[PDB]
Amino acid sequence: KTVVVTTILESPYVMMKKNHEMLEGNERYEGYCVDLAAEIAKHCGFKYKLTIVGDGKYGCRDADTKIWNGMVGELVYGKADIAIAPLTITLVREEVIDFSKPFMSLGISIMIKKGTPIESAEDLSKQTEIAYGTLDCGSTKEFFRRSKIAVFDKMWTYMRSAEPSVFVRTTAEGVARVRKSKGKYAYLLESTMNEYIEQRKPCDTMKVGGNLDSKGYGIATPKGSSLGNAVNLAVLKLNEQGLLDKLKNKWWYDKGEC
Amino acid sequence: KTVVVTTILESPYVMMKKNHEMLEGNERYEGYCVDLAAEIAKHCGFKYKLTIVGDGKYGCRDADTKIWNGMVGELVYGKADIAIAPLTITLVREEVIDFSKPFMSLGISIMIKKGTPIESAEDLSKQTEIAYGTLDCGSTKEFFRRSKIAVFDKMWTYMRSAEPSVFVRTTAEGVARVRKSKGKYAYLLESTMNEYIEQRKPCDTMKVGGNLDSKGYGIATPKGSSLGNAVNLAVLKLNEQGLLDKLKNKWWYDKGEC
Numbered sequence: 318k319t320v321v322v323t324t325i326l327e328s329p330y331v332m333m334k335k336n337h338e339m340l341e342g343n344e345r346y347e348g349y350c351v352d353l354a355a356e357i358a359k360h361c362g363f364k365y366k367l368t369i370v371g372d373g374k375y376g377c378r379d380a381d382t383k384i385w386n387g388m389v390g391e392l393v394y395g396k397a398d399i400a401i402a403p404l405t406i407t408l409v410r411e412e413v414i415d416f417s418k419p420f421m422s423l424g425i426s427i428m429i430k431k432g433t434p435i436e437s438a439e440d441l442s443k444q445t446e447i448a449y450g451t452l453d454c455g456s457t458k459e460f461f462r463r464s465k466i467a468v469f470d471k472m473w474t475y476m477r478s479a480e481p482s483v484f485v486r487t488t489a490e491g492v493a494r495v496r497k498s499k500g501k502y503a504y505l506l507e508s509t510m511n512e513y514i515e516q517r518k519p520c521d522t523m524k525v526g527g528n529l530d531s532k533g534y535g536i537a538t539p540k541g542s543s544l545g546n547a548v549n550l551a552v553l554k555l556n557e558q559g560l561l562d563k564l565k566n567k568w569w570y571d572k573g574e575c
Numbered sequence: 576k577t578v579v580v581t582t583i584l585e586s587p588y589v590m591m592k593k594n595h596e597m598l599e600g601n602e603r604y605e606g607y608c609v610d611l612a613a614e615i616a617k618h619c620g621f622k623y624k625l626t627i628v629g630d631g632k633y634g635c636r637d638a639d640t641k642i643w644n645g646m647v648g649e650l651v652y653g654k655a656d657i658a659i660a661p662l663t664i665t666l667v668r669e670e671v672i673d674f675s676k677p678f679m680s681l682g683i684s685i686m687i688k689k690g691t692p693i694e695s696a697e698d699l700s701k702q703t704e705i706a707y708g709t710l711d712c713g714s715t716k717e718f719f720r721r722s723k724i725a726v727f728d729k730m731w732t733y734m735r736s737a738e739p740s741v742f743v744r745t746t747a748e749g750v751a752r753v754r755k756s757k758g759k760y761a762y763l764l765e766s767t768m769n770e771y772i773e774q775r776k777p778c779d780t781m782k783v784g785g786n787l788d789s790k791g792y793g794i795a796t797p798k799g800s801s802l803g804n805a806v807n808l809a810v811l812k813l814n815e816q817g818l819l820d821k822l823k824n825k826w827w828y829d830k831g832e833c
């Protein structure tokens with residue numbers, strides 16, 4: 318009856334409200350995906366409960382066991398009915414879960430500490446002084462692992478063998494490593510996150526170069542779920558009425574600190 | 576057996592080749608969607624015939640008869656098996672046909688003759704010396720018809736009543752109208768088309784302002800078609816392999832003249 322919605326604590330998509338300890342249920346959280354969940358539910362006519370993914374991951378498949386983890390795993394194994402999160406539409410995921418048409422367009426981008434002498438992925442690939450990595454267990458890592466493009470495969474070959482590990486567990490971890498490393502670590506992450514952090518104090522990062530690829534986030538449901546059709550129409554309706562653009566301005570720019 | 580593909584003459588998606596008259600069947604055409612059709616057919620394992628939509632339109636629904644025309648109508652009434660074209664994914668279309676995940680991202684943009692005193696949509700709406708319109712029977716017109724945004728609804732109010740008509744039957748006619756109007760006509764069209772034309776002789780137009788919205792083109796199939804699933808997985812594969820980006824540079828930027 319009540320739809321279980323899996324999501325992930327990733328700013329500004331879903332964040333704990335300042336006073337969450339005094340609030341209950343869905344009211345504990347705020348953010349772009351919290352706002353969007355409320356609208357999808359109202360347009361599709363269901364009640365829902367927001368739940369934070371237990372392992373804190375977006376999702377990947379273990380090479381050995383073939384088991385899915387993260388939000389993808391929660392849908393695949395029946396622990397949640399829908400995921401409303403910055404979850405990237407990819408071929409390997411569409412093979413095991415369903416996605417709506419995208420609600421946000423984005424691409425992989427580079428985050429540097431201001432003043433770092435890097436302007437592009439080609440620049441990162443041609444040097445060794447500045448380290449760089451991506452989030453573990455997400456679509457960005459898979460992009461580099463799978464790429465046949467020479468620049469990106471060169472980047473992958475470095476990243477997969479760098480020690481200590483250049484991969485991080487959360488976006489926040491990646492941004493902190495950029496901020497604390499004096500220009501000697503650059504972080505590869507989606508343009509949406511990069512753009513958001515660029516407007517947050519202490520205003521010491523910047524996005525550089527163009528996007529490396531072009532993709533989308535979608536609302537995900539278990540394969541053949543009865544909800545997929547209505548959720549897809551809801552995303553299209555809300556895009557056409559300007560809601561998605563209005564939400565992006567609210568959470569990225571209206572609140573910008575830089 | 577042979578899959579009938581509906582498409583539309585729209586540069587640089589589908590164009591007649593230089594020496595088409597000595598060529599036959601699919602070989603008569605070239606462009607981004609021609610290459611894309613060949614890739615999709617190779618991955619999905621079918622043979623196909625390209626056919627240009629009889630009425631030269633993308634597709635809209637007649638408000639009195641409720642009959643669909645254009646490429647959307649060819650799908651709806653069973654005259655074609657698949658549409659491979661710059662066809663915009665929209666709510667009202669998703670109600671009668673199926674769409675793949677998008678193969679290209681885009682937005683509505685403004686095209687002016689160079690030197691025209693217009694910088695934005697708000698600029699057009701606050702004056703009257705320069706007329707402006709959109710393509711008939713497409714998603715851009717409908718966007719303005721349905722817009723609740725003050726600047727956009729106001730534009731629509733002007734466009735719908737304008738005399739003589741500011742709407743055009745083809746993109747080519749819109750561009751020609753901009754070029755021959757001495758700065759007194761501006762054209763609202765998708766950013767993909769705008770960006771292509773800006774790079775072609777006689778280099779007298781320019782895209783101005785940001786995109787007015789964000790959406791995508793998809794490969795469309797009749798509702799419940801056997802083809803839909805494979806076609807969707809194929810578009811995702813092609814994007815991940817970087818082929819879509821390669822095609823984009825081949826047809827937009829390697830082909831610039833200005």
Ligand SMILES: N[C@@H](CCC(=O)O)C(=O)O
Pocket residue numbers: 375376403404405452454455456457458505506507
């Ligand atoms: N949006 C990504 C997570 C972030 C990233 O990989 O950079 C995913 O769905 O895996």
Ligand SMILES: N[C@@H](CCC(=O)O)C(=O)O
Pocket residue numbers: 633634661662663710712713714715716763764765
């Ligand atoms: N891509 C549009 C046609 C061009 C336009 O409306 O600007 C459609 O599918 O309707």
Ligand SMILES: [Zn+2]
Pocket residue numbers: 333337
């Ligand atoms: Zn807390």
Ligand SMILES: [Zn+2]
Pocket residue numbers: 356359360
């Ligand atoms: Zn609403």
Ligand SMILES: [Zn+2]
Pocket residue numbers: 595596
């Ligand atoms: Zn001829």
Ligand SMILES: [Zn+2]
Pocket residue numbers: 614617618818
């Ligand atoms: Zn191929």
